[PDB]
Amino acid sequence: EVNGTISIGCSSLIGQTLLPEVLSLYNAQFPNVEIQVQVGSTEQIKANHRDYHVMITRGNKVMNLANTHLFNDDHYFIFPKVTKLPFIEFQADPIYINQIKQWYNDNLEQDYHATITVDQVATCKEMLISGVGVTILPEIMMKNISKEQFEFEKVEIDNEPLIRSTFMSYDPSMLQLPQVDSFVNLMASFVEQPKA
Amino acid sequence: EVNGTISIGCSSLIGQTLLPEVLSLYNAQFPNVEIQVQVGSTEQIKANHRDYHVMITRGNKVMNLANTHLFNDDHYFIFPVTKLPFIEFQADPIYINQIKQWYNDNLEQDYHATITVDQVATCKEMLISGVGVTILPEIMMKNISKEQFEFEKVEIDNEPLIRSTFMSYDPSMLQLPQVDSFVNLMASFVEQPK
């Protein structure tokens, strides 16, 4: 049997969408593995990289590690079925937030200004659902947003969708741990789409 | 005419349940206030209290601060049972030990967590995707299919297992209009008409 412990560090939004699905598969195949999950900012995770066998983060490849591109998110601007409403911003690295800002300016009348800022995308989405304001979300976080209360407009810059990449990172030496080699191979196949 | 910045630090599960609801009121009444929210563990927030005008945490009162009890949560054991993995979240040890002791008293096996997660939110998503079973605070139970899952209330000696939520702040801070505003709005908000 595969066993021991696997310690996973990932972006907060990953811990509420992808990871539970991956862990249903993984625990079904490798039930004697004990699993530890810690969520956080990409910068936190990368900082604590040594507490984790494997990290799942957003942005770019991590330094001095193996990286596996998992997928890309599109983005939607989401609002009540607009420049008079407050915009909710979430914390991420500055290139990304700056694309969102530049888009707000290009496609809307006012200058961009965050009224509410939260650090997690999940919080941001719940702020949206409660009517605190409008926002831009990556598509993987758009489930269960009422299509009767809200309109969804896709974010493109020039004529290119605004996208963000998710990566799995690990020290290739860790694959000597059966339980890590298992998780990494399971994810390789999990992120492939049957209908390519 | 109330403005400035208010900086809120709260428990993760609060940031996806209570706080958005509170902030819809607050922003409506005090639109010229800029709001910053940071989420995390109770001990994180307590560790960073210098960054926040106001904290909302779970557990006990915080030391050398004003405290306002906001409410108490009941808990439920939620399952599709001792062959299924249990999902444990991180919190202080008295509380986790109540859950362990309860699982032992009321189920056959010894308590053992197969999956452990940092946040209650993750734990709930783990639950919804069939990873396993778990105990949740009732405020985190919305949108769990009553058709796929059963819900059993957690009692210990016929007393519900409950956890408390507190708002903590330095009283001197109420000199900031935008903080005095938020604290009074929360006083109102946590009261029940009925």
Side-chain angles (χ1 to χ4, degrees), chain A residues 1-33 35-196, chain B residues 1-49 51-100 102-194:
Chain A
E1 299 290 336
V2 181
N3 51 39
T5 289
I6 187 169
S7 176
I8 292 168
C10 65
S11 170
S12 150
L13 97 70
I14 293 297
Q16 282 193 72
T17 60
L18 177 79
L19 193 63
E21 308 296 350
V22 175
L23 291 189
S24 175
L25 288 165
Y26 182 93
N27 177 254
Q29 301 171 28
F30 305 116
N32 296 120
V33 175
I35 301 159
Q36 305 171 0
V37 174
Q38 174 73 223
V39 304
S41 86
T42 277
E43 188 202 344
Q44 263 149 19
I45 300 316
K46 275 186 284 208
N48 294 305
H49 75 266
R50 287 221 171 101
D51 306 328
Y52 308 127
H53 301 112
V54 52
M55 311 179 268
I56 298 161
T57 61
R58 284 169 71 77
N60 316 289
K61 300 191 292 206
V62 187
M63 279 296 102
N64 308 307
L65 288 177
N67 293 271
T68 290
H69 186 255
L70 302 191
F71 63 91
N72 293 329
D73 266 292
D74 285 358
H75 293 79
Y76 290 78
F77 174 54
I78 307 173
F79 50 85
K81 231 161 177 279
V82 87
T83 21
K84 312 253 67 190
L85 295 164
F87 187 99
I88 308 155
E89 169 187 307
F90 58 72
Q91 156 196 122
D93 60 79
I95 306 292
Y96 180 30
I97 300 303
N98 181 72
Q99 299 172 267
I100 287 149
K101 297 181 184 198
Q102 238 129 251
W103 182 93
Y104 190 95
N105 279 338
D106 295 331
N107 300 83
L108 308 167
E109 322 196 26
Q110 319 287 42
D111 272 310
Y112 169 100
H113 159 262
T115 292
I116 301 115
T117 59
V118 308
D119 63 315
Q120 289 189 2
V121 179
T123 300
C124 182
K125 168 195 190 170
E126 290 299 330
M127 303 266 143
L128 174 83
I129 290 149
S130 301
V132 186
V134 308
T135 203
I136 287 173
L137 293 177
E139 192 169 14
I140 203 185
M141 283 294 274
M142 267 170 45
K143 301 172 156 299
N144 307 318
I145 297 175
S146 170
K147 300 207 203 319
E148 322 187 10
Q149 180 179 358
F150 295 104
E151 207 159 320
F152 301 71
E153 169 170 359
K154 184 184 185 175
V155 184
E156 301 188 303
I157 296 164
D158 237 350
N159 301 284
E160 205 70 358
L162 164 56
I163 67 185
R164 186 147 168 91
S165 302
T166 303
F167 294 93
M168 180 179 61
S169 325
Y170 58 102
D171 183 331
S173 285
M174 289 305 183
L175 298 183
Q176 300 163 66
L177 284 70
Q179 75 268 29
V180 171
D181 188 46
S182 280
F183 178 89
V184 170
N185 287 336
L186 186 273
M187 190 80 58
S189 108
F190 187 91
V191 301
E192 289 309 325
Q193 311 185 67
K195 316 168 186 151
Chain B
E1 80 116 6
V2 170
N3 52 40
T5 292
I6 186 173
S7 164
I8 293 152
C10 69
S11 174
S12 312
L13 90 76
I14 294 294
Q16 284 182 239
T17 59
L18 187 81
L19 195 56
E21 286 296 320
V22 168
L23 291 180
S24 173
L25 288 164
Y26 183 91
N27 177 73
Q29 302 180 25
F30 308 108
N32 301 119
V33 174
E34 159 188 304
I35 298 152
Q36 303 170 19
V37 173
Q38 178 64 52
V39 143
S41 79
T42 281
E43 303 75 354
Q44 274 176 257
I45 300 309
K46 281 198 270 190
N48 295 338
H49 69 264
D51 300 322
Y52 311 125
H53 303 122
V54 186
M55 298 175 267
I56 301 163
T57 61
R58 288 168 64 85
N60 311 116
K61 309 196 160 165
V62 188
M63 219 87 276
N64 303 301
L65 288 180
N67 293 266
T68 292
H69 183 270
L70 296 184
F71 65 89
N72 292 329
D73 264 295
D74 291 343
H75 297 73
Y76 289 81
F77 174 49
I78 303 171
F79 50 87
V81 89
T82 68
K83 326 294 172 179
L84 312 178
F86 188 96
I87 310 164
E88 162 185 316
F89 54 79
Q90 215 166 273
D92 64 83
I94 306 306
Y95 171 41
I96 300 305
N97 182 67
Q98 293 178 282
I99 282 160
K100 299 158 102 241
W102 184 91
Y103 187 109
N104 280 328
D105 293 340
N106 292 83
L107 307 169
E108 237 174 304
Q109 300 202 20
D110 275 316
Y111 173 90
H112 154 75
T114 288
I115 298 107
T116 60
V117 310
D118 193 41
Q119 301 185 165
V120 183
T122 302
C123 176
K124 168 190 191 181
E125 297 308 323
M126 300 281 148
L127 173 81
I128 291 149
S129 311
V131 180
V133 303
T134 193
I135 282 166
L136 288 183
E138 191 177 8
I139 209 185
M140 287 290 285
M141 271 180 34
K142 307 174 82 63
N143 305 302
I144 296 173
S145 167
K146 298 206 163 293
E147 296 165 41
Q148 182 181 1
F149 295 101
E150 188 151 341
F151 297 76
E152 161 169 348
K153 185 180 187 181
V154 176
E155 309 186 315
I156 296 174
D157 313 335
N158 312 90
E159 276 205 278
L161 168 51
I162 65 186
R163 188 146 162 94
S164 287
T165 302
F166 294 94
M167 179 179 60
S168 321
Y169 57 103
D170 186 334
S172 193
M173 211 67 74
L174 299 175
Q175 300 167 239
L176 281 66
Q178 77 275 24
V179 182
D180 187 46
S181 291
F182 178 91
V183 165
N184 284 339
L185 180 144
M186 193 76 61
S188 213
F189 182 91
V190 299
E191 287 309 310
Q192 296 232 250
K194 317 181 300 208

